[PDB]
Coordinates of C-alpha atoms in Angstrom, one line a residue:
Chain A
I249 CA -0.1 -0.5 0.0
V250 CA 1.3 3.8 -1.0
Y251 CA 0.2 6.2 1.5
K252 CA 1.9 9.6 -0.3
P253 CA -1.2 12.8 0.2
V254 CA 0.9 15.9 0.0
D255 CA 0.2 19.5 1.6
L256 CA 1.0 22.6 0.1
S257 CA -1.9 24.6 1.9
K258 CA -2.0 27.3 3.9
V259 CA -4.3 29.4 6.4
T260 CA -3.7 33.1 6.3
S261 CA -4.7 36.7 7.9
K262 CA -3.9 40.5 8.4
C263 CA -5.6 42.5 10.4
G264 CA -4.4 46.6 10.3
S265 CA -5.2 46.9 14.0
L266 CA -7.1 44.9 16.4
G267 CA -8.3 46.5 19.3
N268 CA -10.9 49.2 21.2
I269 CA -12.5 46.4 22.9
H270 CA -14.8 46.3 26.1
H271 CA -15.9 43.0 27.7
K272 CA -18.2 43.4 30.7
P273 CA -19.4 39.7 31.8
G274 CA -22.2 40.5 33.9
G275 CA -22.4 37.7 37.3
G276 CA -25.8 37.3 38.4
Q277 CA -27.5 35.5 41.9
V278 CA -27.3 31.9 42.0
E279 CA -29.3 29.6 44.5
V280 CA -29.0 25.9 45.5
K281 CA -30.7 23.9 48.4
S282 CA -30.4 20.4 48.2
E283 CA -32.7 18.7 50.8
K284 CA -32.8 14.7 50.6
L285 CA -30.7 13.5 47.5
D286 CA -29.4 9.9 47.6
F287 CA -26.8 9.1 44.5
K288 CA -25.6 5.3 43.8
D289 CA -23.4 6.7 41.1
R290 CA -20.2 8.9 40.5
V291 CA -21.4 12.9 40.5
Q292 CA -19.6 16.1 39.4
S293 CA -20.9 19.2 39.9
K294 CA -20.4 22.8 39.1
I295 CA -22.0 26.1 40.4
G296 CA -21.3 29.4 40.5
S297 CA -22.5 32.9 38.7
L298 CA -20.5 33.3 35.9
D299 CA -17.6 30.8 33.7
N300 CA -16.1 33.2 30.7
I301 CA -13.7 32.2 28.2
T302 CA -12.7 35.5 26.3
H303 CA -9.7 34.7 23.6
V304 CA -8.5 38.3 20.9
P305 CA -5.8 36.5 19.2
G306 CA -3.8 38.3 16.6
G307 CA -3.7 35.7 14.6
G308 CA -6.2 33.0 16.1
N309 CA -5.9 30.4 12.9
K310 CA -6.8 26.9 13.2
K311 CA -5.5 23.8 10.6
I312 CA -6.3 20.1 12.0
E313 CA -5.1 17.4 10.2
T314 CA -5.4 13.7 10.5
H315 CA -4.6 10.4 8.8
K316 CA -5.2 6.6 9.4
Chain B
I249 CA 3.2 -0.3 3.3
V250 CA 4.9 2.8 2.7
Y251 CA 3.8 5.7 4.8
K252 CA 5.9 9.0 3.5
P253 CA 2.5 11.8 3.9
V254 CA 4.3 15.3 2.8
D255 CA 3.5 18.4 4.7
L256 CA 5.1 21.8 3.7
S257 CA 1.9 23.8 4.9
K258 CA 1.9 27.1 6.8
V259 CA -0.5 29.2 9.3
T260 CA 0.8 32.9 9.6
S261 CA -1.1 36.1 11.0
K262 CA 0.2 39.9 10.7
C263 CA -1.3 42.0 13.1
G264 CA -0.4 45.4 12.9
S265 CA -1.4 46.4 16.4
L266 CA -3.2 44.1 19.7
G267 CA -4.2 46.3 22.7
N268 CA -6.3 49.2 24.0
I269 CA -8.5 45.7 25.4
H270 CA -10.6 46.2 28.9
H271 CA -11.9 42.8 30.2
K272 CA -13.8 43.2 33.6
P273 CA -16.2 39.7 34.4
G274 CA -18.3 40.5 36.9
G275 CA -18.5 38.8 40.3
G276 CA -21.7 37.8 41.1
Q277 CA -23.7 36.1 44.5
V278 CA -23.3 32.1 44.9
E279 CA -24.9 30.5 48.0
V280 CA -25.5 26.3 48.3
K281 CA -27.5 24.6 51.4
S282 CA -27.0 20.6 51.0
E283 CA -28.8 19.2 53.7
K284 CA -29.2 15.3 54.2
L285 CA -27.5 14.6 50.9
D286 CA -25.8 10.7 50.4
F287 CA -23.4 9.5 47.9
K288 CA -22.0 5.9 47.0
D289 CA -19.5 6.5 45.0
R290 CA -17.2 9.5 44.4
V291 CA -17.9 13.3 43.7
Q292 CA -16.3 15.9 42.1
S293 CA -17.5 19.6 42.6
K294 CA -16.6 23.5 42.1
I295 CA -18.0 25.9 44.0
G296 CA -17.0 29.8 43.0
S297 CA -18.7 33.2 41.9
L298 CA -16.3 33.8 38.4
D299 CA -14.5 30.9 36.3
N300 CA -12.5 32.9 34.0
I301 CA -10.1 32.7 31.0
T302 CA -8.3 35.3 29.0
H303 CA -6.1 34.8 25.8
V304 CA -4.6 37.8 24.1
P305 CA -2.0 36.2 22.3
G306 CA -0.1 38.4 19.8
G307 CA -0.2 34.8 17.7
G308 CA -2.7 32.2 19.3
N309 CA -2.3 30.0 15.9
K310 CA -3.0 26.2 16.3
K311 CA -1.9 23.4 14.0
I312 CA -2.7 19.8 15.7
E313 CA -1.4 16.7 13.3
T314 CA -2.2 13.1 14.0
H315 CA -1.2 9.5 12.3
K316 CA -2.1 6.2 12.7
Chain C
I249 CA 7.0 -1.5 6.8
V250 CA 8.1 1.8 5.8
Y251 CA 7.0 4.8 8.3
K252 CA 8.9 8.1 7.0
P253 CA 6.2 11.2 6.7
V254 CA 7.8 14.5 6.1
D255 CA 7.3 17.7 7.7
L256 CA 9.2 20.8 7.0
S257 CA 5.8 23.0 8.0
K258 CA 5.8 26.6 9.8
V259 CA 3.2 28.3 12.5
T260 CA 4.3 32.0 12.2
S261 CA 3.1 35.4 13.8
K262 CA 3.9 39.2 13.4
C263 CA 2.5 41.4 16.1
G264 CA 3.4 45.1 15.8
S265 CA 2.6 45.8 19.3
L266 CA 1.4 43.8 22.3
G267 CA 0.0 46.1 25.3
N268 CA -3.0 48.5 26.4
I269 CA -4.5 45.7 28.4
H270 CA -6.3 46.3 31.1
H271 CA -8.1 42.6 32.8
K272 CA -10.0 43.0 36.3
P273 CA -12.0 40.2 37.3
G274 CA -14.3 40.8 39.9
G275 CA -14.6 38.3 43.0
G276 CA -18.2 37.6 44.0
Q277 CA -19.3 36.2 47.9
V278 CA -19.4 32.7 47.8
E279 CA -21.3 30.6 50.7
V280 CA -21.5 26.7 51.2
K281 CA -23.1 25.0 53.9
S282 CA -23.3 21.3 54.1
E283 CA -25.1 19.6 57.4
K284 CA -25.2 15.5 57.6
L285 CA -23.2 14.7 54.2
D286 CA -22.3 11.2 53.9
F287 CA -19.7 9.9 51.5
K288 CA -19.0 5.8 50.7
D289 CA -15.8 7.0 48.1
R290 CA -13.5 9.9 47.5
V291 CA -14.4 13.5 47.3
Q292 CA -12.5 16.5 45.3
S293 CA -14.0 20.0 46.1
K294 CA -13.1 23.6 45.4
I295 CA -14.9 26.4 46.6
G296 CA -13.9 30.0 46.1
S297 CA -15.3 33.2 44.7
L298 CA -12.3 33.9 42.1
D299 CA -10.3 31.1 39.6
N300 CA -8.4 32.9 37.2
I301 CA -6.1 32.2 34.1
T302 CA -4.8 34.9 31.9
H303 CA -2.4 34.3 28.7
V304 CA -1.0 37.3 27.2
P305 CA 2.1 35.7 24.8
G306 CA 3.7 37.5 22.6
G307 CA 3.7 34.1 20.1
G308 CA 1.3 31.7 21.9
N309 CA 1.6 29.3 19.1
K310 CA 0.8 25.4 19.3
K311 CA 2.1 23.1 16.9
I312 CA 1.3 19.4 17.7
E313 CA 1.9 16.0 16.7
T314 CA 1.1 12.4 17.1
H315 CA 2.4 9.3 15.4
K316 CA 1.2 5.4 16.2
Chain D
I249 CA -51.8 83.0 76.4
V250 CA -52.0 80.0 77.9
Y251 CA -49.9 77.1 76.9
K252 CA -50.0 73.8 79.0
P253 CA -50.8 70.5 76.6
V254 CA -50.1 67.7 79.0
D255 CA -48.7 64.1 77.3
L256 CA -49.4 61.0 79.6
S257 CA -49.0 59.0 76.3
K258 CA -47.0 55.5 76.3
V259 CA -44.8 53.8 73.3
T260 CA -43.6 50.1 74.2
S261 CA -42.7 46.6 73.0
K262 CA -42.0 42.9 73.9
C263 CA -40.2 40.8 72.1
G264 CA -39.8 37.2 73.7
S265 CA -36.4 36.5 71.4
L266 CA -34.8 38.9 68.6
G267 CA -32.2 36.7 66.7
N268 CA -30.9 34.2 64.0
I269 CA -30.3 37.3 61.3
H270 CA -28.2 36.6 58.5
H271 CA -27.5 40.0 57.0
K272 CA -25.2 39.7 53.6
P273 CA -25.2 42.7 51.6
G274 CA -23.6 42.2 48.3
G275 CA -21.0 44.3 46.8
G276 CA -21.4 44.5 43.2
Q277 CA -18.4 46.3 40.6
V278 CA -18.4 49.9 39.7
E279 CA -16.5 52.3 37.3
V280 CA -16.3 56.2 36.8
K281 CA -14.5 57.9 33.9
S282 CA -14.8 61.4 33.9
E283 CA -13.2 63.2 31.1
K284 CA -12.9 67.0 30.6
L285 CA -15.9 68.6 33.1
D286 CA -16.0 71.8 34.3
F287 CA -17.7 72.5 37.6
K288 CA -17.9 76.9 38.0
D289 CA -19.7 76.1 41.3
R290 CA -19.6 73.6 44.2
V291 CA -19.2 70.2 44.5
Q292 CA -19.9 66.7 46.4
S293 CA -19.0 63.5 45.1
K294 CA -19.7 59.4 46.6
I295 CA -18.5 56.9 45.0
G296 CA -18.6 53.0 46.3
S297 CA -19.9 49.4 45.7
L298 CA -21.9 49.3 48.7
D299 CA -23.6 51.8 51.7
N300 CA -25.0 50.1 54.0
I301 CA -26.7 50.9 57.1
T302 CA -28.2 47.8 59.5
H303 CA -30.6 47.9 63.1
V304 CA -31.4 45.4 65.0
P305 CA -32.3 47.0 68.2
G306 CA -34.1 45.4 71.2
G307 CA -36.1 48.3 71.2
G308 CA -36.1 50.7 68.6
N309 CA -39.0 52.9 69.4
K310 CA -39.0 56.4 68.6
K311 CA -41.3 59.3 70.5
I312 CA -40.9 62.9 68.4
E313 CA -42.6 66.0 70.3
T314 CA -42.2 69.5 68.8
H315 CA -44.2 73.2 70.2
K316 CA -44.1 76.4 68.8
Chain E
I249 CA -47.9 84.2 78.1
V250 CA -47.5 81.1 80.6
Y251 CA -45.6 77.9 78.8
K252 CA -45.9 75.2 80.9
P253 CA -46.4 71.7 79.1
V254 CA -46.0 68.8 81.1
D255 CA -44.3 65.5 79.7
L256 CA -44.8 62.8 81.7
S257 CA -44.3 60.2 79.0
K258 CA -42.5 56.9 78.4
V259 CA -40.9 54.8 75.9
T260 CA -39.7 51.3 76.8
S261 CA -38.8 48.0 75.8
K262 CA -38.6 44.5 77.0
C263 CA -36.4 41.9 74.6
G264 CA -35.8 38.3 76.1
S265 CA -32.9 38.2 74.1
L266 CA -31.1 39.9 71.5
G267 CA -28.2 38.0 69.8
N268 CA -27.3 35.1 66.7
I269 CA -27.1 37.8 64.4
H270 CA -24.7 37.2 61.3
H271 CA -23.9 40.6 59.4
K272 CA -21.2 40.0 56.7
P273 CA -21.2 42.9 54.3
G274 CA -19.6 42.4 50.6
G275 CA -17.1 44.9 49.8
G276 CA -16.7 45.0 45.7
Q277 CA -14.6 46.6 43.6
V278 CA -14.3 50.5 42.6
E279 CA -12.2 52.3 40.4
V280 CA -12.4 56.5 39.4
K281 CA -10.7 57.5 36.3
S282 CA -10.5 61.8 36.4
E283 CA -8.7 63.3 33.2
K284 CA -8.5 66.8 32.8
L285 CA -11.6 68.3 35.4
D286 CA -11.8 71.9 36.2
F287 CA -12.8 73.2 39.7
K288 CA -13.7 76.9 40.2
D289 CA -15.4 76.2 43.8
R290 CA -14.7 73.9 46.7
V291 CA -14.9 70.1 46.2
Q292 CA -16.1 67.0 48.8
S293 CA -14.9 63.6 47.3
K294 CA -15.5 60.1 49.3
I295 CA -14.6 57.1 47.3
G296 CA -14.3 53.4 48.6
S297 CA -15.4 50.1 48.2
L298 CA -17.8 49.9 51.5
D299 CA -19.4 52.3 53.9
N300 CA -21.1 50.6 57.0
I301 CA -22.6 51.4 59.7
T302 CA -24.1 48.7 62.2
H303 CA -26.8 49.0 65.4
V304 CA -27.3 46.4 67.8
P305 CA -28.4 47.7 70.8
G306 CA -30.2 46.2 73.8
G307 CA -32.6 49.5 74.1
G308 CA -31.9 51.7 70.8
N309 CA -35.0 54.0 71.6
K310 CA -35.3 57.5 70.8
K311 CA -37.1 60.7 72.1
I312 CA -37.0 64.1 70.7
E313 CA -38.3 66.7 71.7
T314 CA -38.4 70.7 71.1
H315 CA -39.6 73.9 72.4
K316 CA -39.8 77.6 70.5
Chain F
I249 CA -43.2 85.5 80.3
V250 CA -43.4 82.7 82.0
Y251 CA -41.5 79.8 80.7
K252 CA -41.5 76.2 82.7
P253 CA -42.0 73.1 81.2
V254 CA -42.3 70.5 83.1
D255 CA -40.6 67.1 82.1
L256 CA -40.6 63.7 84.2
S257 CA -40.6 61.7 81.4
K258 CA -38.3 58.4 80.6
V259 CA -36.7 56.3 78.4
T260 CA -35.8 52.7 79.3
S261 CA -35.1 49.1 78.0
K262 CA -34.8 45.3 79.4
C263 CA -32.5 43.0 77.4
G264 CA -32.3 39.5 79.5
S265 CA -29.2 39.1 77.2
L266 CA -27.3 40.9 74.6
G267 CA -24.6 38.4 72.7
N268 CA -23.7 35.8 69.9
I269 CA -23.1 38.6 66.9
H270 CA -20.6 38.0 64.4
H271 CA -19.7 41.1 62.3
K272 CA -17.1 41.0 58.9
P273 CA -17.5 43.6 57.1
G274 CA -16.0 42.8 53.6
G275 CA -12.9 45.5 52.2
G276 CA -12.9 45.5 48.7
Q277 CA -10.6 46.6 46.2
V278 CA -10.2 50.6 45.0
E279 CA -8.6 52.2 42.3
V280 CA -8.4 56.1 42.0
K281 CA -6.0 58.2 38.7
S282 CA -6.2 61.4 38.5
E283 CA -4.5 63.5 35.4
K284 CA -4.4 66.9 34.9
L285 CA -7.1 68.4 37.6
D286 CA -7.4 71.8 38.3
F287 CA -8.7 72.8 41.9
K288 CA -9.5 76.7 42.8
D289 CA -10.7 76.5 45.9
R290 CA -10.4 73.8 48.8
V291 CA -10.9 69.8 48.8
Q292 CA -12.0 67.5 51.1
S293 CA -11.0 64.0 49.9
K294 CA -11.4 60.2 51.5
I295 CA -10.4 56.9 49.7
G296 CA -10.4 53.8 51.2
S297 CA -11.4 50.6 50.6
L298 CA -13.2 50.1 54.0
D299 CA -15.1 52.6 56.6
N300 CA -16.8 51.1 58.8
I301 CA -18.7 52.0 62.3
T302 CA -20.3 49.7 64.7
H303 CA -22.4 50.3 67.7
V304 CA -23.8 47.0 70.3
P305 CA -24.4 48.9 73.4
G306 CA -26.6 46.8 76.3
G307 CA -28.9 50.5 76.6
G308 CA -28.0 52.7 73.9
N309 CA -31.1 54.5 74.6
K310 CA -31.3 58.7 73.9
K311 CA -33.5 61.9 75.3
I312 CA -33.0 65.3 73.4
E313 CA -34.4 68.4 74.4
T314 CA -33.9 71.8 72.8
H315 CA -35.9 74.7 74.6
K316 CA -35.5 78.8 73.3

């Protein structure tokens, strides 16, 4: 079997300026009041007003390759 | 079997200026009351007003490659 | 079997300036009242107003390869 | 002129118990940007996340009298 | 002119117990950027996350009287 | 003119117990940037995370009188 794929591709971006960005995620109020819960198997729990992810990359380009 | 893929590819970015970025995530108020719980197998817990991730890379480009 | 993949690829970024970034995550108020909890196996717990991660690299580029 | 008003009145309270009070005023995030303001007359200014007044008196009764 | 007002009044309270009070005012985050302000007359300014007043008197009763 | 007001009034309190009071004012974070401010008359300024006043008197009663 011959497996010889060729990749000469390019991912490119030009940004003259990136900025004057104001990000103000709002919190909010959270309340949790459990009483008589029973767990017969494993548990994962998250509690919180704000979960925030912010990306401001100058590039931020993504290339994914997979061969099998 | 001959496995000989070729990769001459590129991921590239030009950013003339990255900046003037204001990021101000707000907290918020959290309460958790739990009383009479029972767990027969393992537990993971997170509690907290804010969980925050911020990326401001000058590049931030990603190339992911996998061969099997 | 012959395994000889060829990789001459590149990940690159040009950033003229990186800066004037103001990051101010707000705390928030957190409360946790447990009373009669019972755990028959291991527990992992995190409690806290703010969990914060911040990255401001001049590059921040990633190239990942896996071969099997 | 005769001024002889008579006051025999009473203000009274009975409290069997006062307590098990949980008061948790939330803060919040505040920002003030002023730029080119001009004040030709006097100024009073207050800036702050929380201004809180709390009264838990065992009595707390008030009587006000004025004669002219 | 005859001025002879008579005051035999009473302000009273009975409290069996005062207590088990939890007061936890949250701070909060405050920011003030001024740039080119001009004041031609006097200025009063207060800046601060928390301003708090708390009264837990066993009595706390008030009587105010004025004659003119 | 005859001025002879009569005051035999009373302010009183009975408190069986005063206590088990937990007061925890939170600080908070404060920032103040001024740049080119101009003041032509006097200035009063206060800057600080927490300003706190707490009163827990067994009595705390007040009687105020004014005559003119």
